[PDB]
Symmetry: D2
Amino acid sequence: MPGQQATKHESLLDQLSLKGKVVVVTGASGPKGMGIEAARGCAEMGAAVAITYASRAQGAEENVKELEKTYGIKAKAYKCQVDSYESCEKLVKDVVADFGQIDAFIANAGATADSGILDGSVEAWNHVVQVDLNGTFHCAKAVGHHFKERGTGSLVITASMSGHIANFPQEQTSYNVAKAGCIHMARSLANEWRDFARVNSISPGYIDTGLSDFVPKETQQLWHSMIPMGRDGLAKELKGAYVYFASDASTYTTGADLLIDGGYTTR
Amino acid sequence: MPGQQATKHESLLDQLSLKGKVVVVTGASGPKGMGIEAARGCAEMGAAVAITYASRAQGAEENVKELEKTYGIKAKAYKCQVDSYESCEKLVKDVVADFGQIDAFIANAGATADSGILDGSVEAWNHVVQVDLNGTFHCAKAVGHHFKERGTGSLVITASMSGHIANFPQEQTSYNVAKAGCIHMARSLANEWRDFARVNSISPGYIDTGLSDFVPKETQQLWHSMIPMGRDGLAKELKGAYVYFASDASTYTTGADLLIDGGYTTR
Amino acid sequence: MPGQQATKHESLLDQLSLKGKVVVVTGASGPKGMGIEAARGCAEMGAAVAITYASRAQGAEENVKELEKTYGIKAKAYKCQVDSYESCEKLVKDVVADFGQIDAFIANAGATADSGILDGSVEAWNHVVQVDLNGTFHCAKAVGHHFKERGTGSLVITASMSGHIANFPQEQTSYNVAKAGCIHMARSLANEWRDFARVNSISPGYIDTGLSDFVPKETQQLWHSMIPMGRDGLAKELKGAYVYFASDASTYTTGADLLIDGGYTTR
Amino acid sequence: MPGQQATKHESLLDQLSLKGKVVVVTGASGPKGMGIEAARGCAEMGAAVAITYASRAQGAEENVKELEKTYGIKAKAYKCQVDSYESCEKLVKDVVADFGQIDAFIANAGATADSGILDGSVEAWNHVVQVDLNGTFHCAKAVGHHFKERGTGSLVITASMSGHIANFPQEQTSYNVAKAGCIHMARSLANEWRDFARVNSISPGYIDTGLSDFVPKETQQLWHSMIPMGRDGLAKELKGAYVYFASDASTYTTGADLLIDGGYTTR
Ligand code: NA
Ligand code: NA
């Protein structure tokens, strides 16, 4: 396939449709996460969906059941520890073997940092990066081989607004740096794979996935006052961006990043 | 504070659907241009579409007849000179009476520059600025008032990668600067209208709109060798983005810019 | 006459030195301010300095007297209404008639905005854009043709972080937009003037130029909490950057922007 | 002590002076490299420099010899392999002993890649990030502690234009990614250390330092044609920027990036 071409579709619903296509989502283990909302939308467009869990399959099995029944499409759960290259390789191999191919891959590494560099140890730095950055790389490396052979593919990397600015008042430089590396990785691979696959990143701001409770009333109040919208966003508001990049609705969009932060980076 | 709330739809198809809504597109009087494709996509989403045209009511009318016939929705043309605030004002006055409302407004003004500032005259800069910058500003302000009442709205500003880098080898700083202004304008307004409307910008790259003949095949190859995908975009590859921002599929995205340049900015 | 080569100087003090050179500063006209602190730093470098005043020439005369009696260099004042091309072109014709040449040009457009797009009028938008955006275009266009004849030059445009972000809680989109246009204008012009001059820009944050008394203390305490340095900056903190771009200390720096905001945009 | 206080000097020269101060440069073992030129510039300002070498002890010795001859300042070389945190911890400890203190730190971790993500091995990715990104973190963390101890300090991180774009036609995503994290490391750390030190980065473009390995002549022509200035930069053209961020001539500038690429990123 001499380079990636434009969509032969004039119809918008056809550009968005993922019938006959396969999409893998590394998140998709919880009930209201960025991951399952990515799987949700993709399934809604008619795509067979593969989803991964880190250590506990339970939540991931209950999602596969939900995705099948509600959207009536083939879905399966697989284990994946993005921080292990062997695990991500196995992921791509088992999926391709079960689904026959992989058209789009949505990677998501969400380890958080709990301090600044000075207060934090080296191990803790290394960890957030290994998982958040090296984790995304493995995903890309593992699936990029598949894409090059098929002469097609869309890689969607979940970054973060934290890849653009540093959150306040929480100190998490390790996390912000791995996220920025993630954003640029999207631009660099977009170019490296320019003949066969598209690469884009989405940078979400504060999104509630059900763990808002574990946050002090003050802390949240301060954050909201910096978000022009004045409220956290929801994962279901991130489903459109994911399908948008995984489908043929962006056949000319590669190496791009879309901040979904309620306007936080506007100030 | 709060301000704007998340979509009421869990379904992504319901998020994109523009049924029961009004969207106006400027400069959509051509066959295969960024403008019409933005109206086609929206119309496909089942929405009432109002388009505009600078001069010679020709292509606009045929588009109107064609948008109603293949999509079954209400449409209507309107003569508008974005470089005039009175004309935009009148545009939003009329549309609002024939359609009852405007939910989304897609602003487009692509006058171009054929020289640098040293070679161009002051008048040549004034014209590109007034049309491309002040015009988009005329659209925003005129619709802003309307949105501020209904407590809802989405303005999508069609910027350009030229607002990011300076094109080579053609000299067109006036055009560049203008678009840059539109890029940040949408960012500054996302903040200003945080209580009632979302504002986002799309930065297209080299889009073949059926006028490559007016450009030296030598120039194209040079452009092509700087575009990772090695080709020009097609306005249809842009409809998804316009529809993405103008609908309930992006209720937490305000102040964002999406580059659709085949990867041009990547290098 | 060759092109744009690296400095012939190995010593840093030699690259910074503006001995034998002529620099023009448009903002200086008062005892304090970004403009005056630029002239002083350049003068301290041994340059011949020409400064401008919008009117109320007395203040510009005072400064001229100071520079010459403090640094022992030659200096003079001229009137320039950056919003008038002819004024800027006459500004260049005069300086050169009296100085013989212009090596560096530091353009400053001071127009401020006092409201958002909705409350402000079109007249108000136009003014700020004409003065802040077009006025800088006028400056560059005026000094550009001279720089082209000599095969050398250094244009430094004073932008603002407002061109990077939207100030909070005051609404000043026109200003922010004009400022964005200016950051990109220096990028685009760095490429346009690539065979003869360099073009860079400075994006200062909150600088105590002498009007903090007007801004409510409550508002000033809010800004301060959003600046990691937690204070306003001082114009003496700008002269370092000014001589940097205007002197041979940056013969390979062109098309870049230097943020001096106390880490404001960092968040 | 509201965060960081502005320079007490009004004189630029007095602000640029580094007398009574100590600065360390990570890799100044060559004759015309970025680091030795940073070390000269600082010396010239009257600083006691402390350069390091990974293994080139003899090379670091010729430099110390020279730095002491021409500038008659105190200079000592040390061995440090940035990918080792232990080696950076003992770097600081040692310097603090021999010089009593460190006022400015200039890190320059620049190992290269030579291939893209698909042809490259996992270890190859790991190596570049560990030295270029984790290497830089080590320096920041090792010296960070010391800065917080004196409530003063400047860290100048040498990133790279590759941190902004992706080099063409050579594939080096790992390098670009590591550089991207370094740029954002500077902003995030600027915010983290807001109470005792500034942090900034320089993103040089292509620089002829001494060795640019074996790259076909035709590729080198390709690079030059993408550099508006049309030439490689020299390291001596980078010294002004290093001294700028290292001294008091930049007391309100923190969290910023300064591109020195002959205008490459401009396009
Ligand atoms: Na570029
Ligand atoms: Na911010």
